[PDB]
CSV table of C-alpha atoms in Angstrom, one decimal:
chain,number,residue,atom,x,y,z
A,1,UNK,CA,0.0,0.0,0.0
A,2,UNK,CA,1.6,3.3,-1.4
A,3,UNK,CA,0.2,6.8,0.0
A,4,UNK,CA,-1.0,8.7,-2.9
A,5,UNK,CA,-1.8,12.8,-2.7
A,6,UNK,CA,-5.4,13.0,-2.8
A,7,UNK,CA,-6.4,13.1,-6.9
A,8,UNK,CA,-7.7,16.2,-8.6
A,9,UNK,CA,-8.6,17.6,-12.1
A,10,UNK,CA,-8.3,20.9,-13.8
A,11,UNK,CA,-11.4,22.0,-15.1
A,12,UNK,CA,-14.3,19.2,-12.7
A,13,UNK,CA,-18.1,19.7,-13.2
A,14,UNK,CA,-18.4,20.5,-9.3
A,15,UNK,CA,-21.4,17.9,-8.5
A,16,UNK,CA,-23.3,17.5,-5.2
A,17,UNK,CA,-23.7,13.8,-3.9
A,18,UNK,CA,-26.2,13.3,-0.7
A,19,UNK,CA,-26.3,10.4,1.1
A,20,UNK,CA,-29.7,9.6,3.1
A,21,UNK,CA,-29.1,7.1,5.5
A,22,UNK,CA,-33.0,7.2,6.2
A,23,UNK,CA,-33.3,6.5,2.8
A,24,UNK,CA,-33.6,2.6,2.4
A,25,UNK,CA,-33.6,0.3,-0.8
A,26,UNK,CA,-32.9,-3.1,-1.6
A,27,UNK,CA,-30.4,-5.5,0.7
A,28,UNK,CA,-28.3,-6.9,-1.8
A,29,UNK,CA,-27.7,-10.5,-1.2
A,30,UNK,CA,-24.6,-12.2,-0.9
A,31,UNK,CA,-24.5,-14.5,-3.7
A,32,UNK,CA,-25.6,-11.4,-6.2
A,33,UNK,CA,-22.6,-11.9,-8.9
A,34,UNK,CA,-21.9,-14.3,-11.3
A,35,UNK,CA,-21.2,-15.1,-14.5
A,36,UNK,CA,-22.2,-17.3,-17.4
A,37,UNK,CA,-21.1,-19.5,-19.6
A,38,UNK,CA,-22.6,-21.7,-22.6
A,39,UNK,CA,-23.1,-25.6,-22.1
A,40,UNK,CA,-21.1,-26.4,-24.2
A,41,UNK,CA,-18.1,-25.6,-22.4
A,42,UNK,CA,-19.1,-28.6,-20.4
A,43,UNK,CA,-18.2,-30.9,-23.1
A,44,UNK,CA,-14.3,-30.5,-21.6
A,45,UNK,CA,-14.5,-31.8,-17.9
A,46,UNK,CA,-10.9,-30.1,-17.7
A,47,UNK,CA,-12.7,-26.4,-18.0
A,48,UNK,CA,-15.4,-26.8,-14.8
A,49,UNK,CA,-12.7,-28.8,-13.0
A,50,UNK,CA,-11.6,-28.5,-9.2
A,51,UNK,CA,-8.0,-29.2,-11.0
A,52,UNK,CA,-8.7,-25.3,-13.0
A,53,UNK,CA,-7.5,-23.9,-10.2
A,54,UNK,CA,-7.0,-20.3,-11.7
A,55,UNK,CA,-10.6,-20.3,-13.2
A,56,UNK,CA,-12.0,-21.2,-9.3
A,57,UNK,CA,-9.0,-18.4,-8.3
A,58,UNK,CA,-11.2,-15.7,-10.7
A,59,UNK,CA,-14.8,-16.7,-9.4
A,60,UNK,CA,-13.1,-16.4,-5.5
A,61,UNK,CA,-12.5,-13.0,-6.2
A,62,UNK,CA,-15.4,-11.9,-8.3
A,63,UNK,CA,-17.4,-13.0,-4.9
A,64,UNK,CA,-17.1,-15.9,-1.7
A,65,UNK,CA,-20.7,-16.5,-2.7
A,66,UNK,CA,-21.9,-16.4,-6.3
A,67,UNK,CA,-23.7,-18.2,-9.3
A,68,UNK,CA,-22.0,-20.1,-12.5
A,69,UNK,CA,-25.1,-20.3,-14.9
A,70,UNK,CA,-24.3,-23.0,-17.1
A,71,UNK,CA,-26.7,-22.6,-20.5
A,72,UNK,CA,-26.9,-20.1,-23.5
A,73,UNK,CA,-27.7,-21.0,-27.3
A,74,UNK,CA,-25.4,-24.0,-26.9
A,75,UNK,CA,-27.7,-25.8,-24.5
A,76,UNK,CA,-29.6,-27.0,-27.4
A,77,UNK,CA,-26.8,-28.6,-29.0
A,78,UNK,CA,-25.3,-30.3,-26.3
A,79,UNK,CA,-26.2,-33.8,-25.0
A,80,UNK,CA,-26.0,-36.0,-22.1
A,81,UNK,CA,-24.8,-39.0,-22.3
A,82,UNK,CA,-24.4,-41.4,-19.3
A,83,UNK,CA,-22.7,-43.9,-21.9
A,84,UNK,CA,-19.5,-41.8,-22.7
A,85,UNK,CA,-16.4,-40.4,-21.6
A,86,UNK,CA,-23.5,-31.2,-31.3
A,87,UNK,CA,-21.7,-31.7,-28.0
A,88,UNK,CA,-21.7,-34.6,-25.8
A,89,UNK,CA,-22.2,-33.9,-21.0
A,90,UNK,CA,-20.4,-37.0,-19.3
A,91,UNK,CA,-20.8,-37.9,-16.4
A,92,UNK,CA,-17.2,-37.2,-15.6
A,93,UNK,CA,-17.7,-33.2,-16.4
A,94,UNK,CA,-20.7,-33.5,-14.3
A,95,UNK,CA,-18.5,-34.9,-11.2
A,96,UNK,CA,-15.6,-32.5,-12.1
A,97,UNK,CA,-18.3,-29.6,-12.3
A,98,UNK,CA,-19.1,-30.2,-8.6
A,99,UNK,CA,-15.7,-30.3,-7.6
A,100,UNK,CA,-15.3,-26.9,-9.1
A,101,UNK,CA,-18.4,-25.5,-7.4
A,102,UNK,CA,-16.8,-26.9,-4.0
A,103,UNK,CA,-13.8,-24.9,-4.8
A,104,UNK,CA,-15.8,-21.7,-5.4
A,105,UNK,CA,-18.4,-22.0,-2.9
A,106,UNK,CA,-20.5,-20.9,-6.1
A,107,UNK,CA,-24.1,-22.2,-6.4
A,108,UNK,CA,-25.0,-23.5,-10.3
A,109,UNK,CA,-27.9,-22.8,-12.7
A,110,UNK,CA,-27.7,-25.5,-15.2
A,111,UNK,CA,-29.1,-25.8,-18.7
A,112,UNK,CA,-31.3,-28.9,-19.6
A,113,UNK,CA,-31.4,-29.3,-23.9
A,114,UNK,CA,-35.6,-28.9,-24.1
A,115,UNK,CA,-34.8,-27.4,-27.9
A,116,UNK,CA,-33.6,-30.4,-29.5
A,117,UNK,CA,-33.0,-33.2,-26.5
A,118,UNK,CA,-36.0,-35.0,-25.1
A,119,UNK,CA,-38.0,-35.2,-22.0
A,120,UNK,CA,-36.2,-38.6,-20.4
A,121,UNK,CA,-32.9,-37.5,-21.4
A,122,UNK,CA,-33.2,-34.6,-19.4
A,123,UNK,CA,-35.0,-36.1,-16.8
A,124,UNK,CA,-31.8,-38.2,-16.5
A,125,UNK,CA,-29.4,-35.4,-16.7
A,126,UNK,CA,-31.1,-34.0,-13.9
A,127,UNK,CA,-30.4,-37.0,-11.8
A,128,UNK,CA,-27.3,-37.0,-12.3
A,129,UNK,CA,-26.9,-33.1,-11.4
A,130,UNK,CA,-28.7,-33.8,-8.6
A,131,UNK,CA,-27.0,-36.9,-7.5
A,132,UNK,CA,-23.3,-35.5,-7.5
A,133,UNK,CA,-24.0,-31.5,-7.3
A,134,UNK,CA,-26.7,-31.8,-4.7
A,135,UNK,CA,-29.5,-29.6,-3.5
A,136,UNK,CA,-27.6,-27.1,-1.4
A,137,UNK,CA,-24.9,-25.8,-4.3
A,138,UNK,CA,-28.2,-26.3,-7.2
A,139,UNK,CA,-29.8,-23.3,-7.3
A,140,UNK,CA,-31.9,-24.3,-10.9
A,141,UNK,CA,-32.6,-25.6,-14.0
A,142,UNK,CA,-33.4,-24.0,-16.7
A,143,UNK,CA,-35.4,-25.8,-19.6
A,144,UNK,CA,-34.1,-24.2,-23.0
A,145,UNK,CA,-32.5,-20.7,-23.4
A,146,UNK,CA,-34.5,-18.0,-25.2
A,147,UNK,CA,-37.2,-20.4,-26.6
A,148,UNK,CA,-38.8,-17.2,-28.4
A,149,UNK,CA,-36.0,-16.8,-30.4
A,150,UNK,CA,-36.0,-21.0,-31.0
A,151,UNK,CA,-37.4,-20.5,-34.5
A,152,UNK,CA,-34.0,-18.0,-35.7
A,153,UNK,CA,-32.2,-21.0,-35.3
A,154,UNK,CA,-35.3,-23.6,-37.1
A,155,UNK,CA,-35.1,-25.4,-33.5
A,156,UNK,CA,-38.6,-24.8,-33.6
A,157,UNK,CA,-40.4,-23.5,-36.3
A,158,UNK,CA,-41.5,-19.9,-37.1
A,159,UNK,CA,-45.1,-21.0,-35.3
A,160,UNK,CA,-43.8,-21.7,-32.0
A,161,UNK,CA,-45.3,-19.6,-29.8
A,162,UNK,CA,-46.1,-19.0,-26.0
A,163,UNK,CA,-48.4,-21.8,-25.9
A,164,UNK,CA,-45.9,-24.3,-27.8
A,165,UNK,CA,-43.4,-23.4,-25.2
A,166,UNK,CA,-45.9,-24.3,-22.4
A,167,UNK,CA,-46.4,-27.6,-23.4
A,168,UNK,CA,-42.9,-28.3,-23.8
A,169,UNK,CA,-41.8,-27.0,-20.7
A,170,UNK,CA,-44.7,-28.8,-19.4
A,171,UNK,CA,-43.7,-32.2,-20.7
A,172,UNK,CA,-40.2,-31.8,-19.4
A,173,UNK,CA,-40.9,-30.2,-15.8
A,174,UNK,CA,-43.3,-33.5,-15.6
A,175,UNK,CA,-40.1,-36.0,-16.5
A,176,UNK,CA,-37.5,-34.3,-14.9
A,177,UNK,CA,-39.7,-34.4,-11.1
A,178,UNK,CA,-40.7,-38.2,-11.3
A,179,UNK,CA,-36.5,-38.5,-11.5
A,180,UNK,CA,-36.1,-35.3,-8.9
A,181,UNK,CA,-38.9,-34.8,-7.1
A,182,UNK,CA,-37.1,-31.9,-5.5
A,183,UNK,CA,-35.8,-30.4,-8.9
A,184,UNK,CA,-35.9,-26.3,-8.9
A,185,UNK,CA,-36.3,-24.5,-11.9
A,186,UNK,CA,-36.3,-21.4,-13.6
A,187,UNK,CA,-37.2,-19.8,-16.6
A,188,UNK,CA,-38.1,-18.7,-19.2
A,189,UNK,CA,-34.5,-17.6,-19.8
A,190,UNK,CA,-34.7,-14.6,-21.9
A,191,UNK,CA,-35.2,-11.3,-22.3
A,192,UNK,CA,-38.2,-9.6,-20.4
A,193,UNK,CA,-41.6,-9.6,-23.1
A,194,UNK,CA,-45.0,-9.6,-22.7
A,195,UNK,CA,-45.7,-12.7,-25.1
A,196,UNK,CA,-43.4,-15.0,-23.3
A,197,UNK,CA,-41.7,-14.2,-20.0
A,198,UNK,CA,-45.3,-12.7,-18.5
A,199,UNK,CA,-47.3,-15.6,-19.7
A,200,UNK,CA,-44.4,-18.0,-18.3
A,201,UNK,CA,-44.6,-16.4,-14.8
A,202,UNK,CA,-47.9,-16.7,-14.6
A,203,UNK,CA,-48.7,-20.0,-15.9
A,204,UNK,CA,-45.8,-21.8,-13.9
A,205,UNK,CA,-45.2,-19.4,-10.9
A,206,UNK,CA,-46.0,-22.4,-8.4
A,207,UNK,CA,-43.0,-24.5,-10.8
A,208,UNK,CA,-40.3,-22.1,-10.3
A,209,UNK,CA,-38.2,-20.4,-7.7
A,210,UNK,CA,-37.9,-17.5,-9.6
A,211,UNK,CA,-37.6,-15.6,-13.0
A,212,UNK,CA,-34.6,-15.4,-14.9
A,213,UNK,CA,-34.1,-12.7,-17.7
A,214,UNK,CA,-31.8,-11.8,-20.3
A,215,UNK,CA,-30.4,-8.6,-20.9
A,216,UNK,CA,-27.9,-7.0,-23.5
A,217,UNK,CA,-27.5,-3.4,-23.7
A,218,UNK,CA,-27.2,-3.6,-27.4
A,219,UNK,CA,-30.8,-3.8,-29.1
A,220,UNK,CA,-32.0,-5.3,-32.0
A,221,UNK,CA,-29.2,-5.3,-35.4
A,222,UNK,CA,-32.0,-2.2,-36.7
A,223,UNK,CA,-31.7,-0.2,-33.3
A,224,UNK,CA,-28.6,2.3,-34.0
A,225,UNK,CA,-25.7,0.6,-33.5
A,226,UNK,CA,-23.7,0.0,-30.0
A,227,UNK,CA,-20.8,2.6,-29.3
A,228,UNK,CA,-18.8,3.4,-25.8
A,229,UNK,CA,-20.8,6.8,-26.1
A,230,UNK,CA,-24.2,4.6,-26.1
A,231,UNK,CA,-23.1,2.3,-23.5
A,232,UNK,CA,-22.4,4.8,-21.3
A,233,UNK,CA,-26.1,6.7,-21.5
A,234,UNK,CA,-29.2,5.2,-19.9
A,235,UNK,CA,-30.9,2.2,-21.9
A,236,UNK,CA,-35.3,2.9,-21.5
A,237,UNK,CA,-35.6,-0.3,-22.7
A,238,UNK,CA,-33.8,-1.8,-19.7
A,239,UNK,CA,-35.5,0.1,-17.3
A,240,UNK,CA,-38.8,-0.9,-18.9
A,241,UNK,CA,-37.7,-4.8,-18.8
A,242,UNK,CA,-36.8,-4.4,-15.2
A,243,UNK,CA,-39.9,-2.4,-14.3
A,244,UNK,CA,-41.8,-5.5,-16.1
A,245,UNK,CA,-40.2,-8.0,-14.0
A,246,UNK,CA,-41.2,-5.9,-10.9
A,247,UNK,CA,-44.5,-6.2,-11.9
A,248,UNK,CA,-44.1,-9.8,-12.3
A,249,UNK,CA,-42.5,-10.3,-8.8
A,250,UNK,CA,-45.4,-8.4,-7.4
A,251,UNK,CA,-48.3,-10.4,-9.8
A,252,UNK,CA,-46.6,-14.0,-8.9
A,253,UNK,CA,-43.9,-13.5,-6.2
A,254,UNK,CA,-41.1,-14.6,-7.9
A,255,UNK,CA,-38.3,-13.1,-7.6
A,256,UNK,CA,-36.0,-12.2,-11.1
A,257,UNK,CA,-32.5,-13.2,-11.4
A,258,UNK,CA,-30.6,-11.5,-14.8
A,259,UNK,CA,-29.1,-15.0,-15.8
A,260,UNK,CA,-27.1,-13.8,-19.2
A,261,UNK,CA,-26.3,-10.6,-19.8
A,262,UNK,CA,-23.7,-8.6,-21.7
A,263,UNK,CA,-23.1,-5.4,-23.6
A,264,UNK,CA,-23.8,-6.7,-26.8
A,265,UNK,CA,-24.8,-10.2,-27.9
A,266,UNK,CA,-22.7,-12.9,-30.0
A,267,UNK,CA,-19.3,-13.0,-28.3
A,268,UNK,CA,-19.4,-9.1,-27.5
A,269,UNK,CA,-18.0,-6.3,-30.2
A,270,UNK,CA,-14.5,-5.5,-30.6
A,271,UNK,CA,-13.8,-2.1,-29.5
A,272,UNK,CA,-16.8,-1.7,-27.0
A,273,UNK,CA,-17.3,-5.3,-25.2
A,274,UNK,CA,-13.6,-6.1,-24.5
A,275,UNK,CA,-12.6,-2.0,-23.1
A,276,UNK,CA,-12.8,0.0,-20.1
A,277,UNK,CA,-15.9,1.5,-21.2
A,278,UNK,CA,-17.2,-2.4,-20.3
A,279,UNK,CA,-15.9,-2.1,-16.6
A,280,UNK,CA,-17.5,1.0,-16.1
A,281,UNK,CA,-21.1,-0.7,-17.6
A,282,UNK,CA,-20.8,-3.6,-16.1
A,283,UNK,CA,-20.1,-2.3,-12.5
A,284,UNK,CA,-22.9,0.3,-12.6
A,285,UNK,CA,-25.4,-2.3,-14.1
A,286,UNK,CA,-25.0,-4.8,-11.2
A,287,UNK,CA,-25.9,-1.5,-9.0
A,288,UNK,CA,-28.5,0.0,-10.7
A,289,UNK,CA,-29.8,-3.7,-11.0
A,290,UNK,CA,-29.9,-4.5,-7.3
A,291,UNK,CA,-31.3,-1.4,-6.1
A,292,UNK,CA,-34.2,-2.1,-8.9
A,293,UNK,CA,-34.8,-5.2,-6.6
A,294,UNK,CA,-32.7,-8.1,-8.9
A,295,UNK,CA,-31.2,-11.8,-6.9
A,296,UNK,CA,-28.8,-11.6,-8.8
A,297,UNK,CA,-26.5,-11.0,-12.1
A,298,UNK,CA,-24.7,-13.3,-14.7
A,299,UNK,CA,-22.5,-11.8,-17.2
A,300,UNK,CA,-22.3,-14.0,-20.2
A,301,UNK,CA,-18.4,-15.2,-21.5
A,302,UNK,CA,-16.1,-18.1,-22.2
A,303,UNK,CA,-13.0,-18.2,-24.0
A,304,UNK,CA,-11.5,-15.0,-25.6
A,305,UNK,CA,-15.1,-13.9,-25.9
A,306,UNK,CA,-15.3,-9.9,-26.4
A,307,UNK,CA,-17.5,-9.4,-23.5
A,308,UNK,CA,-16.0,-12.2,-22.0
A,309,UNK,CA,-15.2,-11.1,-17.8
A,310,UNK,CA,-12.3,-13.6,-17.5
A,311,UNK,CA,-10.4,-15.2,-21.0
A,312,UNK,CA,-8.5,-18.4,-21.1
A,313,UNK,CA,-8.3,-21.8,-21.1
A,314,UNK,CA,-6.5,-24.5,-18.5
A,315,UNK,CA,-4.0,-25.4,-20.8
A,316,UNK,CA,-2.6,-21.9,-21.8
A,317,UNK,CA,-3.9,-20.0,-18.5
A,318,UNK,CA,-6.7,-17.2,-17.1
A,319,UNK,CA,-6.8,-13.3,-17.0
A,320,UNK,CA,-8.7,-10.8,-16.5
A,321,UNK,CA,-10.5,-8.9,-18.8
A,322,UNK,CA,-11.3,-5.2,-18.6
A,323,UNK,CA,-15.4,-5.9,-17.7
A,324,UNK,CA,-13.7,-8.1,-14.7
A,325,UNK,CA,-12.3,-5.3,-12.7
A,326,UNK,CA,-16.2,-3.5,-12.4
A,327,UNK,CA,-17.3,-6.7,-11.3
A,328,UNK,CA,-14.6,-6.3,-8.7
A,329,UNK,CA,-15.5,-2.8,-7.6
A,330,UNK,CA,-18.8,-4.5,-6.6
A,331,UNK,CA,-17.1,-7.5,-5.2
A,332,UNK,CA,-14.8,-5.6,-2.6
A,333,UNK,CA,-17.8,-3.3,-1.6
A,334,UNK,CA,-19.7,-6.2,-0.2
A,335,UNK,CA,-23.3,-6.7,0.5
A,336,UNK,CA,-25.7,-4.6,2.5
A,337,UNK,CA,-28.4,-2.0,2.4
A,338,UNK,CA,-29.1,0.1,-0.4
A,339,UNK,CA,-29.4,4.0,0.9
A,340,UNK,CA,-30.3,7.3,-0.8
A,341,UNK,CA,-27.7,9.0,-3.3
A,342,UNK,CA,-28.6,12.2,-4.7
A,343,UNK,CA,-26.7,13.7,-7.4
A,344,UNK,CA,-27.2,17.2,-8.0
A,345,UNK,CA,-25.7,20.7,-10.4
A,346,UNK,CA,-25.2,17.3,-12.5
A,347,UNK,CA,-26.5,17.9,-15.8
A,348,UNK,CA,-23.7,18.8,-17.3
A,349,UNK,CA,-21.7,15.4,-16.4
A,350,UNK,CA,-25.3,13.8,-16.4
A,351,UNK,CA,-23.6,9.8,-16.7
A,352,UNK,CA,-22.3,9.9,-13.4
A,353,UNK,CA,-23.9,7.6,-11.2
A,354,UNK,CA,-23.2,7.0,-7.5
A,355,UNK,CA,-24.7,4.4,-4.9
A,356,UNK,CA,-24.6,4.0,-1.5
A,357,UNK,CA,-24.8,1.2,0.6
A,358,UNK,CA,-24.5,0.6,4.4
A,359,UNK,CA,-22.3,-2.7,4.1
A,360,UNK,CA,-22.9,-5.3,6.2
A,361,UNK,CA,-20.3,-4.9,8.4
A,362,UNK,CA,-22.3,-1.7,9.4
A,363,UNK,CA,-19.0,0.8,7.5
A,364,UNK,CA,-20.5,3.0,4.6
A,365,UNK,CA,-19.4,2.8,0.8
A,366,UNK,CA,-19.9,4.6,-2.1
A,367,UNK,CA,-19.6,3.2,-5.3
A,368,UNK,CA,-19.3,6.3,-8.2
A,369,UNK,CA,-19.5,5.3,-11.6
A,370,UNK,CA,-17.9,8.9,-13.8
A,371,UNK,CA,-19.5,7.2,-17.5
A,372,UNK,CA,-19.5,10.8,-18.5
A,373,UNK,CA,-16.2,10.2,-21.4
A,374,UNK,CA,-14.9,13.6,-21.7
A,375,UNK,CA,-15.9,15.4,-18.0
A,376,UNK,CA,-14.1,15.3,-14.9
A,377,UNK,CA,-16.2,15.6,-11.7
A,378,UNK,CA,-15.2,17.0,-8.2
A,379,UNK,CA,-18.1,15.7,-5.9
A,380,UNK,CA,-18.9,17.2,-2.6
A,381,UNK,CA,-20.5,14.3,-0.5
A,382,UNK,CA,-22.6,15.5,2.4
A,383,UNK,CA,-25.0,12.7,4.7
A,384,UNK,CA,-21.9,10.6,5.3
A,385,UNK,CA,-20.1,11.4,8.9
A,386,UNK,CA,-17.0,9.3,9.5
A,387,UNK,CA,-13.3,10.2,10.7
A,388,UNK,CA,-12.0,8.8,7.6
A,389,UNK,CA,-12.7,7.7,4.1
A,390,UNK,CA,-10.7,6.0,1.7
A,391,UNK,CA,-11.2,5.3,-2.5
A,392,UNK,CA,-10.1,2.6,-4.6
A,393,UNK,CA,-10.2,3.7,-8.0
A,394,UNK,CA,-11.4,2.1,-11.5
A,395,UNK,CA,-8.7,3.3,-13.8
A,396,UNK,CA,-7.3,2.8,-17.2
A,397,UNK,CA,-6.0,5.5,-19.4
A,398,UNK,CA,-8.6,5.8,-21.8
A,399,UNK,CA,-12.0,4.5,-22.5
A,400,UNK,CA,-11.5,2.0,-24.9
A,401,UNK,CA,-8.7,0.5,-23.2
A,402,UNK,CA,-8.6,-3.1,-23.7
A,403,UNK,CA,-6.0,-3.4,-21.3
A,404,UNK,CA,-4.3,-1.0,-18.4
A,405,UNK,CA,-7.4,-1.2,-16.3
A,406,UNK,CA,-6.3,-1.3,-12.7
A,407,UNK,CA,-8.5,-1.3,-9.4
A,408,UNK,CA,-6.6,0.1,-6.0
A,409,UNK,CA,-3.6,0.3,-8.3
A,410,UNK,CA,-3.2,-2.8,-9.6
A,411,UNK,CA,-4.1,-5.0,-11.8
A,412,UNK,CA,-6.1,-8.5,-11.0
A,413,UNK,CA,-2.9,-11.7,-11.6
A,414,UNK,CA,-2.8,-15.0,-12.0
A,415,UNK,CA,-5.9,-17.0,-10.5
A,416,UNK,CA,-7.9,-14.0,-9.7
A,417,UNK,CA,-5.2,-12.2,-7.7
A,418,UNK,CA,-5.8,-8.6,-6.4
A,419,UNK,CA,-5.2,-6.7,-3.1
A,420,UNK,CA,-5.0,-2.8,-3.2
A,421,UNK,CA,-1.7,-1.0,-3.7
A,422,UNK,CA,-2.7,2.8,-3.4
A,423,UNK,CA,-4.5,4.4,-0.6
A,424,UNK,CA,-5.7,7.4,-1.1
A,425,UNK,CA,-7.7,9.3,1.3
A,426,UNK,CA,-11.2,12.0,0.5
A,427,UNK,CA,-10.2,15.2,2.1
A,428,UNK,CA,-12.8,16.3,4.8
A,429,UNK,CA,-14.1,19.2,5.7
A,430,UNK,CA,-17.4,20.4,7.8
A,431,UNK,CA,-18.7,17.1,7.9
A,432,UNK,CA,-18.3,16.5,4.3
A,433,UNK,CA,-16.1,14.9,1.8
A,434,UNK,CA,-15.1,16.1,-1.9
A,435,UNK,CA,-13.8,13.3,-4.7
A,436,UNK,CA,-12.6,14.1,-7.9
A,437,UNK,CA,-12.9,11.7,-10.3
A,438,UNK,CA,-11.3,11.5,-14.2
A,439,UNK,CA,-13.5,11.3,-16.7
A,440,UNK,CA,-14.3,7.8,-17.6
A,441,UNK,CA,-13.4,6.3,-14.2
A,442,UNK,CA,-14.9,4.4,-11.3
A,443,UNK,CA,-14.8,4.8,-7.6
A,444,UNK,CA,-15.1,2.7,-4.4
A,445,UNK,CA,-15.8,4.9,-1.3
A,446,UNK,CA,-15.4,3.2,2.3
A,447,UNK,CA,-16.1,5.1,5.3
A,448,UNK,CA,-14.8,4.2,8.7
């Protein structure tokens, strides 16, 4: 740990940031990260291994509790297969998968093939998850991924509809419980819509433990294209999909878990899913996320993936990717209690976003996203009385960085390695605090 001179900038929008402690939203809950990956991964036990001990080293760090989400568009290609040693599950990945859950202390949402595999073979797949996973670390299946968009791929054809779904999901949720009469679910495993994911809630709400969602910040291939600038800004459409899913929590009680997500679909887009920019999205989604009320968040990767969080394989090794380091920001704030964060004399550095939490271990923290690419921001911080705060800062030298993003001053190593190596305290004054912040940067408050 290095002292550093508290940071400033030349020319800041001068901001005003009140924290209400009176002011209560959502607790987030401990196992709120997580990541995602397609099925197919599964088809080499070496990847979900307790022997990939520098993938397990990654998902340590990203949270001690979590969710791997097994699924994605692959899930309809890949096959069990109890008989062996289009993709093929063993029952040796399944046993190495549970070791590599034990090494985590991650609980797993795992894909069953309803697109193309058949009600016994999943039923059977099932079993087996359940036999050598077990209850406690199985937090759901899910029966297909994005069955609305089933008939882009001709897995089902252009008539399959809500109702089709139904019986399918139906037919399996019927096989799979006479082999696991304690199986949980989820679904439907896409993005919020009123022809599918409504409909789905309410027709199987006494099926599932909750609702799980899919989310990319790009839109539709017609909607304009995806840039840093647009990722920074506000998206309507997901505040409309998560005010949906409200509404559905309140309608059904289920809960919603966002089970893939991304900042654009397909493996990501060079020069927006693999920079900074990324970090700075994704740290600020899993906020603005869990004080909307969300379980939980999955960010969708594998491989050398654009958007992937962490890249790499077990045979040539793991890193972190720039998206990684804002799931870090959220991992070293912790859990706890949502509280009031005003932002005010902000319109003209109007992508800042700040969130306060009172952590569980009662200390306050702030958590200041500065999207805003080309303004600095000096905030003054009133609400918050403490003897001493210090940041942690989400850094890298420009916006579409795909590399030199640090956290505390360093970068995540080998195996998910981090500590801090620059301490830098807020200067206080009357009660208050004042933090500048570069353009394009992050911040992690923590008040003694």
């Amino acid at each position: 740990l290095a002292q550093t001179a508290s940071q400033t900038t030349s020319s800041p929008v001068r901001v005003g940031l009140s924290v209400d402690a009176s002011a209560l939203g959502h607790t987030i809950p401990p196992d709120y990260t997580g990541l995602s990956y397609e099925q197919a991964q599964m088809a080499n036990p070496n990847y979900f291994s307790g022997a990939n001990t520098q993938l397990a080293g990654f998902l340590r760090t990203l949270g001690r509790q979590g969710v791997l989400r097994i699924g994605g568009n692959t899930s309809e290609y890949t096959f069990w297969n109890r008989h062996a040693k289009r993709e093929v599950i063993t029952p040796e990945a399944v046993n190495n998968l549970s070791e590599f859950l034990d090494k985590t202390g991650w609980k797993l949402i795992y894909g069953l093939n309803l697109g193309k595999g058949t009600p016994e073979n999943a039923a059977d797949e099932a079993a087996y998850v359940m036999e050598t996973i077990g209850a406690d670390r199985l937090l759901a299946f899910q029966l297909g991924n994005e069955p609305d968009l089933f008939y882009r791929n001709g897995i089902r054809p252009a008539s399959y509809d809500f109702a089709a779904y139904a019986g399918d999901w139906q037919r399996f949720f019927t096989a799979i419980r006479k082999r696991v009469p304690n199986a949980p679910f989820a679904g439907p495993d896409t993005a919020y819509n009123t022809k599918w994911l409504v409909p789905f809630a309410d027709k199987f709400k006494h099926d599932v433990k909750f609702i799980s969602s899919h989310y990319y910040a790009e839109g539709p291939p017609t909607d304009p294209s995806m840039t840093i600038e647009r990722l920074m800004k506000p998206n309507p459409r997901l505040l409309g999909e998560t005010a949906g899913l409200k509404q559905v929590e309140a309608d059904t009680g289920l809960p919603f878990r966002l089970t893939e997500t991304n900042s654009c679909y397909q493996g990501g887009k060079q020069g927006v899913s693999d920079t900074f920019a990324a970090a700075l999205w994704a740290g600020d989604l899993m906020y603005q996320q869990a004080a909307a009320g969300s379980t939980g968040i999955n960010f969708h990767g594998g491989g050398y993936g654009w958007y992937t969080p962490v890249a790499g394989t077990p045979e040539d090794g793991f890193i972190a990717r720039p998206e990684y380091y804002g799931m870090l920001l959220f991992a070293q704030a912790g859990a706890g209690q949502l509280l009031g964060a005003k932002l005010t004399d902000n319109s003209a550095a109007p992508l800042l976003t700040a969130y306060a939490l009172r952590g569980t271990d009662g200390r306050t923290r702030i958590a200041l996203f500065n999207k805003n690419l080309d303004a600095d921001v000096e905030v003054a911080i009133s609400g918050v009385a403490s003897p001493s705060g210090t940041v942690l800062r989400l850094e890298a030298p420009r916006a579409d960085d795909t590399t030199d993003v640090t956290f505390g001053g360093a970068p995540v190593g080998a195996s998910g390695s981090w500590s801090p190596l620059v301490q830098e305290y807020v200067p206080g004054h009357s009660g208050q605090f004042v933090l500048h912040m570069r353009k394009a940067s992050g911040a992690l408050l923590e008040f003694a």
